[PDB]
Amino acid sequence: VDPTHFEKRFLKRIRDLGEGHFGKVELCRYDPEGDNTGEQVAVKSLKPNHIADLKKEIEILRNLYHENIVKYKGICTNGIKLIMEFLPSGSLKEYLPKNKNKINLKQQLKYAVQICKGMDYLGSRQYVHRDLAARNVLVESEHQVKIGDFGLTKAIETKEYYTVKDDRDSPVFWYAPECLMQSKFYIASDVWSFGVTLHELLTYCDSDSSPMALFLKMIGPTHGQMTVTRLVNTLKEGKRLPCPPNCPDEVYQLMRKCWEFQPSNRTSFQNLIEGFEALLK
Numbered sequence: 001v002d003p004t005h006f007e008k009r010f011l012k013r014i015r016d017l018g019e020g021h022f023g024k025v026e027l028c029r030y031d032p033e034g035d036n037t038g039e040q041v042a043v044k045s046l047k048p049n050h051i052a053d054l055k056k057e058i059e060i061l062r063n064l065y066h067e068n069i070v071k072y073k074g075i076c077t078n079g080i081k082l083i084m085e086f087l088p089s090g091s092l093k094e095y096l097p098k099n100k101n102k103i104n105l106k107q108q109l110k111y112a113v114q115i116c117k118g119m120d121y122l123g124s125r126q127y128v129h130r131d132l133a134a135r136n137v138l139v140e141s142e143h144q145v146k147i148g149d150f151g152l153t154k155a156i157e158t159k160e161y162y163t164v165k166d167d168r169d170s171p172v173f174w175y176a177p178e179c180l181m182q183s184k185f186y187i188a189s190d191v192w193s194f195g196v197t198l199h200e201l202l203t204y205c206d207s208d209s210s211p212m213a214l215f216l217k218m219i220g221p222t223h224g225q226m227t228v229t230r231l232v233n234t235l236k237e238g239k240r241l242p243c244p245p246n247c248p249d250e251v252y253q254l255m256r257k258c259w260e261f262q263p264s265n266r267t268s269f270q271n272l273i274e275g276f277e278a279l280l281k
């Protein structure tokens with residue numbers, strides 16, 4: 001028997017966990033016994049082409065092994081489903097609003113370290129994530145977080161960046177200037193998205209403090225097609241997202257080092273780790 005092969009007949013849909021534009025993740029129970037004692041697993045499938053994309057995401061996740069990366073469990077098979085461990089606390093977007101009392105600054109800085117280690121492990125395997133947002137960070141417990149989606153993850157050739165072809169559903173408010181302008185994607189461009197994720201983490205993912213809601217105030221919500229070009233000017237000028245409430249200046253400076261206009265002048269994941277670890281001591 002292949003413990004990574006899940007049979008369709010025993011894979012039972014419970015509820016939806018989230019969706020992209022072509023993908024969706026559901027909570028399922030893999031129940032071969034038929035008595036509802038089987039394990040709960042998270043299942044990624046296509047929304048009814050993108051089979052090639054999902055297949056590449058599977059092969060990428062299958063070979064990543066890190067405590068801050070959601071565990072690959074297997075596949076369900078021309079169609080295919082990705083089986084992962086299920087994390088009941090969901091994403092930081094779900095968890096943080098409901099757990100402000102439990103999650104103090106020290107714990108948010110520990111989550112920040114964990115995101116950086118998982119992201120640094122990804123960079124080391126020569127991958128650019130391209131979609132680092134609090135909605136993609138899963139909560140394992142009060143003491144641990146995991147990167148939980150690799151839907152936009154691309155390999156970097158030999159080259160320092162991956163060049164973007166499809167960009168119509170780009171999370172623009174999480175994107176570095178080189179991504180919004182040229183459509184290039186470096187490890188340093190994931191550092192920029194980490195800065196924005198760190199901002200979300202510090203504001204406990206509150207809808208009103210979202211990087212989009214905030215950036216739409218800094219530019220205007222009624223600009224339709226011109227939003228990105230107007231956003232590109234803001235960053236060109238030198239305007240950044242504000243310091244989150246109750247966020248120490250030492251923390252906000254580590255965040256600003258993620259937001260240098262030029263990728264080569266940006267901090268690394270290793271520097272952020274050292275910087276966060278010094279504040280925790």
Ligand SMILES: N#CCC(=O)N1CCC[C@@H](n2nnc3cnc4[nH]ccc4c32)C1
Nearest residue numbers: 018019020023024025042086087090149
């Ligand atoms: N498609 C897509 C993205 C998507 O559905 N999500 C973003 C990544 C995390 C997904 N999610 N939400 N709650 C979850 C609990 N356990 C999980 N295990 C794997 C994903 C996942 C969960 C939800």
